[PDB]
Design an enzyme around this catalytic site. Structure first.
Site, PDB file in Angstrom:
ATOM      1  N   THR A   1       0.743  -1.157   0.152  1.00  6.24           N
ATOM      2  CA  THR A   1      -0.013   0.191   0.014  1.00  6.24           C
ATOM      3  C   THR A   1       0.639   1.241   0.039  1.00  6.24           C
ATOM      4  OG1 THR A   1      -1.636  -1.043   1.034  1.00  6.24           O
ATOM      5  CG2 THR A   1      -1.802   1.405   1.285  1.00  6.24           C
TER       6      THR A   1
ATOM      7  N   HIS B   1      -2.352  -2.054  -5.668  1.00  9.51           N
ATOM      8  CA  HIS B   1      -2.234  -3.143  -5.927  1.00  9.51           C
ATOM      9  C   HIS B   1      -3.340  -4.183  -5.939  1.00  9.51           C
ATOM     10  CE1 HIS B   1      -2.980  -3.804  -1.746  1.00  9.51           C
ATOM     11  NE2 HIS B   1      -2.182  -2.717  -1.390  1.00  9.51           N
TER      12      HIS B   1
ATOM     13  N   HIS C   1      -0.704  -9.680  -0.158  1.00 16.19           N
ATOM     14  CA  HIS C   1      -0.023  -8.992  -1.442  1.00 16.19           C
ATOM     15  C   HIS C   1       1.419  -8.400  -1.217  1.00 16.19           C
ATOM     16  CE1 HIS C   1      -0.711  -5.098   0.251  1.00 16.19           C
ATOM     17  NE2 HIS C   1      -1.863  -5.522   0.606  1.00 16.19           N
TER      18      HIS C   1
HETATM   19  C1  LIG Z   1       0.785   6.046   1.541  1.00 14.73           C
HETATM   20  C2  LIG Z   1       0.495   7.344   0.904  1.00 14.73           C
HETATM   21  N1  LIG Z   1       1.250   7.964  -0.031  1.00 14.73           N
HETATM   22  N2  LIG Z   1       0.443   9.006  -0.384  1.00 14.73           N
HETATM   23  N3  LIG Z   1      -0.884   8.870  -0.026  1.00 14.73           N
HETATM   24  C3  LIG Z   1      -1.819   9.935  -0.361  1.00 14.73           C
HETATM   25  C4  LIG Z   1      -3.008   9.356  -1.128  1.00 14.73           C
HETATM   26  C5  LIG Z   1      -2.559   9.493  -2.557  1.00 14.73           C
HETATM   27  C6  LIG Z   1      -3.429   8.857  -3.595  1.00 14.73           C
HETATM   28  C7  LIG Z   1      -2.977   8.946  -5.112  1.00 14.73           C
HETATM   29  F1  LIG Z   1      -3.526   9.861  -5.780  1.00 14.73           F
HETATM   30  F2  LIG Z   1      -1.589   9.143  -5.135  1.00 14.73           F
HETATM   31  F3  LIG Z   1      -3.170   7.708  -5.667  1.00 14.73           F
HETATM   32  C8  LIG Z   1      -4.618   8.850  -3.348  1.00 14.73           C
HETATM   33  C9  LIG Z   1      -5.030   8.610  -1.929  1.00 14.73           C
HETATM   34  C10 LIG Z   1      -4.279   9.258  -0.776  1.00 14.73           C
HETATM   35  C11 LIG Z   1      -4.772   9.131   0.533  1.00 14.73           C
HETATM   36  C12 LIG Z   1      -4.453   7.807   1.307  1.00 14.73           C
HETATM   37  C13 LIG Z   1      -5.124   7.792   2.603  1.00 14.73           C
HETATM   38  O1  LIG Z   1      -6.025   8.591   2.783  1.00 14.73           O
HETATM   39  N4  LIG Z   1      -4.687   6.910   3.448  1.00 14.73           N
HETATM   40  C14 LIG Z   1      -5.078   6.892   4.558  1.00 14.73           C
HETATM   41  C15 LIG Z   1      -4.207   7.340   5.966  1.00 14.73           C
HETATM   42  C16 LIG Z   1      -2.891   6.462   5.911  1.00 14.73           C
HETATM   43  S1  LIG Z   1      -1.875   6.782   7.190  1.00 14.73           S
HETATM   44  C17 LIG Z   1      -1.118   8.301   7.050  1.00 14.73           C
HETATM   45  C18 LIG Z   1      -1.382   9.711   7.566  1.00 14.73           C
HETATM   46  C19 LIG Z   1      -0.609  10.849   7.348  1.00 14.73           C
HETATM   47  C20 LIG Z   1       0.540  10.620   6.702  1.00 14.73           C
HETATM   48  C21 LIG Z   1       1.180  11.950   6.687  1.00 14.73           C
HETATM   49  O2  LIG Z   1       0.706  13.122   6.605  1.00 14.73           O
HETATM   50  O3  LIG Z   1       2.505  11.892   6.315  1.00 14.73           O
HETATM   51  C22 LIG Z   1       0.888   9.818   6.160  1.00 14.73           C
HETATM   52  C23 LIG Z   1       0.193   8.349   6.234  1.00 14.73           C
HETATM   53  F4  LIG Z   1       0.791   7.494   5.705  1.00 14.73           F
HETATM   54  C24 LIG Z   1      -2.254   6.234   4.430  1.00 14.73           C
HETATM   55  C25 LIG Z   1      -3.487   6.095   3.340  1.00 14.73           C
HETATM   56  N5  LIG Z   1      -0.985   7.888   0.803  1.00 14.73           N
HETATM   57 CA   LIG Z   2      -3.033  -1.340  -0.443  1.00 16.05          CA
HETATM   58 ZN   LIG Z   3      -3.182  -5.343   2.089  1.00 13.02          ZN
END
Ligand SMILES: Cc1nnn(Cc2cc(C(F)(F)F)ccc2CCC(=O)N2CCC(Sc3ccc(C(=O)O)cc3F)CC2)n1
Ligand SMILES: [Ca+2]
Ligand SMILES: [Zn+2]
Ligand SMILES: *[C@@H]1O[C@H](CO)[C@@H](O[C@@H]2O[C@H](CO)[C@@H](O[C@@H]3O[C@H](CO[C@H]4O[C@H](CO)[C@@H](O)[C@H](O[C@H]5O[C@H](CO)[C@@H](O)[C@H](O)[C@@H]5O[C@H]5O[C@H](CO)[C@@H](O)[C@H](O)[C@@H]5O)[C@@H]4O)[C@@H](O)[C@H](O[C@H]4O[C@H](CO)[C@@H](O)[C@H](O)[C@@H]4O[C@H]4O[C@H](CO)[C@@H](O)[C@H](O)[C@@H]4O)[C@@H]3O)[C@H](O)[C@H]2NC(C)=O)[C@H](O)[C@H]1NC(C)=O
Ligand SMILES: [Ca+2]
Ligand code: NA
Ligand code: NA
Length: 805
Positions: free
Chosen positions: A159, A309, A420
Site C-alpha cells: 500500500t 495493488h 500481496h
Molecule cells: C501512503 C500514501 N502516500 N500518499 N498517500 C496519499 C494518497 C495518494 C493518492 C494517489 F493519488 F496518489 F493515488 C490517493 C489517496 C491518498 C490518500 C491515502 C489515505 O488516505 N490513507 C489513509 C491514511 C494512511 S496513514 C497516514 C497519515 C498521514 C500521513 C502523513 O501526512 O505523513 C501519512 C500516512 F501514511 C495512508 C493512506 N498515501
Molecule cells: Ca493497499
Molecule cells: Zn493489504
C-alpha cells in the site's frame, strides 16, 4: 501538547492545517489526536443517515442532519447525494446513457476541469470482469471512459509504496517509502503502519501531486483521510469543497477506500465474502457521480478510478521459515511476509557475513518457495536497490507464499487468507485504471501501463509542470483527448567518428591469434561496400541510437552487423543486427575456435587485448554479434574482430552462448525476423543509471578493460508478424532483457542441467523495458521510424512479462 478547547465552528474539513497548540478540524486531525473538542459533534454528523427519503423532501433545514433534503440544500452544497433523485424526479447517473464529453461542460467561474482521484486499496485487476455484475457505476466509468486491462504497480506491491508512487511518479527507491515497514540506519529509526514515526516528513521524498499543484497555484484538497471518517462523509466533504467560491475551491481531490483490501486479507481475493465490499465501493462511486450530476459537474470533472495493488491467496500454512535454513537465526532481523529483507541484528557485530547467509538460503530445498538475492542482483526492472532503507539481502517470495524468521513469529503475532507484496509482474498483483471525463478519451481501451506514468498525466490534466520523475512523459498521451504534452527526442550529444582503414596489422601487439590467412575483384569491391555501410539499412532498422552524453566513439560497419564502438570503454556501446526468419545457424569452425583479429580501423591504443584475458583466470570473453549467425563463411571472420569482443565470466558464457546459438533463431522463426541490439551495461552503484568511467569497480586483470555488470538485448519485430522485421510498414513489437553478468549461476537452481532447462527462465526473470536500458546506457533508441514519437514512447515503456492471461 494540544489546547483542544478551541472550536471547529465554521471550520469543518478546513483545507489549511493550523499549527499546535491550536486545535485542528481537517481530515487528518483524528490521526494526530489533535481535533477540537467539538469536531465529532459539528463535523461528523450522522443523524438520519446518508439518503433522502420521500418524507424528507422539502423539509425544514435541520442542521443536526448528516446531509439535507431541504429546498436550500443545492445552494448550500450539502444535499444528500440522492436528493435530486428522490425529491426532484431525476435519474441516478448510472441509469443515464453514456454520451461523449467532447468539451468540458462546467459552471461559470470554473478555470479548469477539476480532477478527482478515486483510489481503492487491493482492487485486483480481474475484479473488473469477475465482479462486473455487482459494480454498475464502476462498469459505466470503465466502458464509457478510457481504461486499461490492468495497471502494473511498483515493487513491493504494498500500500504505502504504491500510493506514494501514484502521487510522485517515482520508484520507491527514489521517494523513500520502500515498504509498509522499514528501518532507516542514518536516522536510526523504524517506520510502521502503526505509530507516529510515519508522520515525520523526513521519510517522504519527491514531490507529490498536491505539492506540485500548490507550488504552481493550483489549490488541492487534502488527499489523506483518517480511518474513522466514513466513506459517505468523505464524499460529502469533496462535494462541499466543490461548492466553495472560485477563489477558495480546490482543483484536485482524492478519495481513498481501505476496501476491498481489508476484506481481501481476511477472505482471499475471490472469497464469497468479497461480493459485498465490491457492492459497497460501487455504491460510493454512485454517490460521487450523483453528487457531481446535482452540481452540474458530471460532464466537467475528470475522474480517475485507480488501485494501488491486487491480492493473492496466501495462508499461514504456506510459510517458509528461515530457522529451517540458518544456524545463526537470532543474529538477524527479518522484514517478513510476501517479501523478505534481512539485516544484522547488531552493527557492533564484526562477525556478520552476508555471503554465508546467502549461501545458506540458496537452492537448499527442492521446492523452495523463495530465492535470496543481494539487492544489486535483483532484476533491474524492479528498480529496488538504491536506498539505504533497502537491506542488502532480499528474498523474492513465490506467489501464494510467505517467509518468516521462526515458527513463533506466526502463532505469537490461522488468521488470514489473502495477501500481496510479490513481484510486480505477477498477475494477481495487477490493479486497475479507468479515466473518465472531458480530457480522457471516449470508449477507449489502452494497453496496460505502469503506475509510475500517472503523475505526469495527472499534471497534464491540471496544466501543471511535473517535478522530475520516473515516468516517460508522452508515453500515456494516447489516454487523452486533448491537453497532450508534446514530447520531443532528446538531442544527440556525441557525434560518432566513421574510421576507415588506418593501421597495419604489425602495429598491433594484442597477443591475439587467428587462423585467417586465406586469399577476387568481384568480391573485393563488394566487401569494401559492406565496410562503408551498404547493408546498414538491413541491420540498423530504426536509425542509429543517439549517444546522450559526452564521449568518443566510432561507427563500425560489417556485412552482418553495425556497432557503436567506445574508445573509452574499449568495447561497443551497442551492436545492431537483423536475423530474418529464413537465416541459418552455423557452428564456429574448429580452426577459428580461439580466433580474435585486430581491427585495422581502430588504434592499438583503443583496443582490447587477448593477453589480459589469458592472465585473468576468472574472466573469459564473448562476442556481441554471434559468430553462429554469420551470413557466409567469409563474413564470419568479421565476428571475431577485437572490436566485437566483450568480457564474460565462463558461468555467464553458458547463458550468452545459448541465447546467441538457439534463442535468437527461435525468436526469428516465431516473430518473422528480429532485429537485435545488444550491449554492455555498467551500474556498479546500482542506481539504474549509466556509470561514468570513474565509477567502475572491476577491470579485466592488468588492463583498462572495464567489466560490465549486465548485458542487454532489445529484440524488435513487426507487430503484424505476417510482415518480416526488415519490411514492416506499421507498429513494432519489442521484448528486451538486462541479464546480470555473474560469475556463477547460483540464481538458477537447475543450472547443472542443459541450458534448455534453465537459461530462458532466467532471461524471462530479467525482462526489461527499452526505457530501463536507456537509463543504464545513456542511449536513445528508435530515432528513425515511420511511427509517431508518442507511439515510440509507449513502445519504449512496454514490458514483456511472460505471465499467462
Ligand atoms: C501512503 C500514501 N502516500 N500518499 N498517500 C496519499 C494518497 C495518494 C493518492 C494517489 F493519488 F496518489 F493515488 C490517493 C489517496 C491518498 C490518500 C491515502 C489515505 O488516505 N490513507 C489513509 C491514511 C494512511 S496513514 C497516514 C497519515 C498521514 C500521513 C502523513 O501526512 O505523513 C501519512 C500516512 F501514511 C495512508 C493512506 N498515501
Ligand atoms: Ca493497499
Ligand atoms: Zn493489504
Ligand atoms: C527516477 O527519477 C528521479 C528524479 O528525477 C531520479 O532521482 C534523481 O537522480 C539524480 C542523480 O542521481 C539526483 O541528483 C542529485 O541530487 C543531489 C541533491 O539532491 C537533493 O535535492 C533534490 C531536489 O529538491 C531532492 O529530490 C533530493 O531528494 C533525495 O534525497 C532525500 C534525502 O536527502 C530523500 O528524502 C529523497 O527520497 C531523495 O532520495 C533519493 O535520492 C538520493 C540522491 O539524491 C539517494 O541517495 C537516495 O537513496 C534516494 O534514492 C535531495 O534532497 C545533488 O547533490 C547531486 O549532485 C552531485 O553530482 C553532480 C553530478 O553532475 C555533481 O555536479 C556534483 O559534484 C554533486 O556531487 C557532490 O556531492 C556528492 C555526494 O555527496 C559528492 O560525492 C561529490 O564529491 C560532491 O561534493 C545530484 O544532482 C536527484 O536528486 C534524484 N532525485 C530523486 C528525487 O531521487 C532517478 O535517477 C530516476 N531513476 C531512474 C532509474 O531513472
Ligand atoms: Ca550507475
Ligand atoms: Na581468462
Ligand atoms: Na545454479
Amino acid at each position: 501538547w494540544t489546547a483542544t478547547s478551541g472550536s471547529c465552528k465554521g471550520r469543518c474539513f478546513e483545507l489549511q492545517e493550523v499549527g499546535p497548540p491550536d486545535c485542528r478540524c481537517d481530515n487528518l486531525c483524528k490521526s494526530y489526536s489533535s481535533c477540537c473538542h467539538d469536531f465529532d459533534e459539528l463535523c461528523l454528523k450522522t443523524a438520519r443517515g446518508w439518503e433522502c427519503t420521500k418524507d424528507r423532501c422539502g423539509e425544514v433545514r435541520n442542521e443536526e442532519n448528516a446531509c439535507h433534503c431541504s429546498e436550500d440544500c443545492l445552494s448550500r452544497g450539502d444535499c444528500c447525494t440522492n436528493y435530486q433523485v428522490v425529491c426532484k424526479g431525476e435519474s441516478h447517473w448510472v441509469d443515464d446513457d453514456c454520451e461523449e464529453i467532447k468539451v468540458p461542460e462546467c459552471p461559470a467561474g470554473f478555470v479548469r476541469p477539476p480532477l478527482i482521484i478515486f483510489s481503492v486499496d487491493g482492487f485486483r485487476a480481474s475484479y473488473m470482469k469477475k465482479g462486473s455484475k455487482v459494480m454498475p457505476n464502476i462498469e459505466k466509468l470503465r466502458s464509457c471512459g478510457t481504461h486499461a486491462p490492468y495497471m502494473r504497480p511498483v515493487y513491493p506491491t504494498k500500500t504505502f509504496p504504491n500510493l506514494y508512487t501514484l502521487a510522485t511518479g517515482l520508484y520507491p527507491e527514489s521517494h523513500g517509502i520502500v515498504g509498509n515497514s522499514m528501518y532507516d540506519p542514518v536516522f536510526d529509526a523504524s517506520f510502521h503502519l502503526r505509530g507516529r514515526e510515519k508522520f515525520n516528513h523526513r521519510w517522504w521524498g519527491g514531490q507529490p501531486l498536491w505539492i506540485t499543484a500548490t507550488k504552481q497555484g493550483v489549490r488541492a484538497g487534502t488527499f489523506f483521510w483518517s480511518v474513522s471518517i466514513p466513506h459517505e462523509r468523505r464524499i460529502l466533504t469533496i462535494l462541499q469543497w466543490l461548492s466553495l467560491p472560485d477563489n477558495e475551491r480546490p482543483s484536485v481531490y482524492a478519495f481513498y477506500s481501505e476496501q476491498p483490501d481489508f476484506s481481501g486479507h481476511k477472505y482471499g481475493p475471490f472469497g464469497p465474502e468479497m461480493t459485498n465490499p465490491l457492492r459497497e465501493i460501487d455504491k460510493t462511486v454512485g454517490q460521487l457521480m450523483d453528487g457531481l450530476k446535482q452540481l452540474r459537474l458530471h460532464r466537467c470533472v475528470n475522474v480517475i478510478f485507480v488501485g494501488d495493488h491486487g491480492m493473492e491467496d496466501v495462508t499461514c500454512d504456506r510459510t517458509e521459515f528461515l530457522s529451517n535454513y540458518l544456524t545463526n537465526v537470532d543474529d538477524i532481523t527479518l522484514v517478513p511476509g510476501t517479501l523478505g529483507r534481512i539485516r544484522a541484528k547488531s552493527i557492533n557485530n564484526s562477525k556478520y557475513d552476508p555471503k554465508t547467509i546467502i549461501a545458506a538460503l540458496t537452492c537448499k530445498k527442492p521446492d523452495q518457495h523463495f530465492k535470496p538475492y543481494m539487492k544489486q542482483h535483483l532484476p533491474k526492472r524492479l528498480h529496488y536497490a538504491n536506498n539505504r532503507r533497502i537491506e542488502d539481502i532480499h528474498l523474492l517470495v513465490d506467489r501464494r507464499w510467505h517467509v518468516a524468521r521462526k515458527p513463533l513469529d506466526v502463532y505469537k503475532k490461522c488468521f488470514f487468507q489473502g495477501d500481496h507484496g510479490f513481484d510486480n509482474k505477477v498477475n494477481s498483483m495487477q490493479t486497475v485504471f479507468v479515466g473518465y471525463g472531458p480530457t480522457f478519451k471516449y470508449r477507449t481501451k489502452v494497453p496496460p501501463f505502469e503506475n509510475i506514468e500517472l503523475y505526469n498525466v495527472m499534471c497534464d490534466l491540471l496544466g501543471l509542470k511535473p517535478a522530475p520523475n520516473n515516468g516517460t512523459h508522452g508515453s500515456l498521451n494516447h489516454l487523452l483527448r486533448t491537453n497532450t504534452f508534446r514530447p520531443t527526442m532528446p538531442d544527440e550529444v556525441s557525434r560518432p567518428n566513421y574510421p576507415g582503414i588506418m593501421y597495419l596489422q604489425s602495429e598491433f601487439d594484442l597477443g591475439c591469434t587467428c587462423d585467417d590467412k586465406v586469399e577476387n575483384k568481384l568480391e573485393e569491391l563488394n566487401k569494401r561496400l559492406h565496410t562503408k555501410g551498404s547493408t546498414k539499412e538491413r541491420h540498423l532498422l530504426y536509425g542509429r541510437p543517439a549517444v546522450l552524453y559526452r564521449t568518443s566513439y566510432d561507427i563500425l560497419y560489417h556485412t552482418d552487423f553495425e556497432s557503436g564502438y567506445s574508445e573509452i570503454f574499449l568495447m561497443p556501446l551497442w551492436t545492431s543486427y537483423t536475423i530474418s526468419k529464413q537465416a541459418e545457424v552455423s557452428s564456429i569452425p574448429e580452426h577459428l575456435t580461439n580466433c580474435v583479429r585486430p581491427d585495422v580501423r581502430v588504434s592499438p591504443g583503443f583496443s582490447q587485448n587477448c593477453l589480459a584475458y589469458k592472465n585473468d583466470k576468472q574472466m573469459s570473453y564473448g562476442f556481441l554479434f554471434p559468430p553462429y549467425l554469420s551470413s557466409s563463411p567469409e563474413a564470419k571472420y568479421d565476428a571475431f574482430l577485437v572490436t566485437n569482443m566483450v568480457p564474460m565470466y565462463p558461468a555467464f558464457k553458458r547463458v550468452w552462448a545459448y541465447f546467441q546459438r538457439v534463442l535468437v533463431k527461435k525468436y526469428a522463426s516465431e516473430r518473422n525476423g528480429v532485429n537485435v541490439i545488444s550491449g554492455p551495461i555498467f551500474d556498479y552503484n546500482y542506481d539504474g543509471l549509466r556509470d561514468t568511467e570513474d565509477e567502475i569497480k572491476q577491470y579485466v586483470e592488468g588492463s583498462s578493460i572495464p567489466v560490465p555488470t549486465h548485458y542487454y538485448s532489445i529484440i524488435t519485430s513487426c507487430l503484424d508478424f505476417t510482415q518480416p522485421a526488415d519490411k514492416c510498414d506499421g507498429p513494432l513489437s519489442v521484448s528486451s532483457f538486462i541479464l546480470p553478468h555473474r560469475p556463477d549461476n547460483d540464481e538458477s537452481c537447475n543450472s547443472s542441467e542443459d541450458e534448455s532447462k534453465w537459461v530462458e527462465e532466467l532471461m524471462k526473470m530479467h525482462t526489461a523495458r527499452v526505457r530501463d536500458i536507456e537509463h543504464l546506457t545513456g542511449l536513445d533508441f528508435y530515432r528513425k521510424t515511420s511511427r509517431s514519437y508518442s507511439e515510440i514512447l509507449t513502445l519504449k515503456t512496454y514490458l514483456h512479462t511472460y505471465e499467462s492471461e
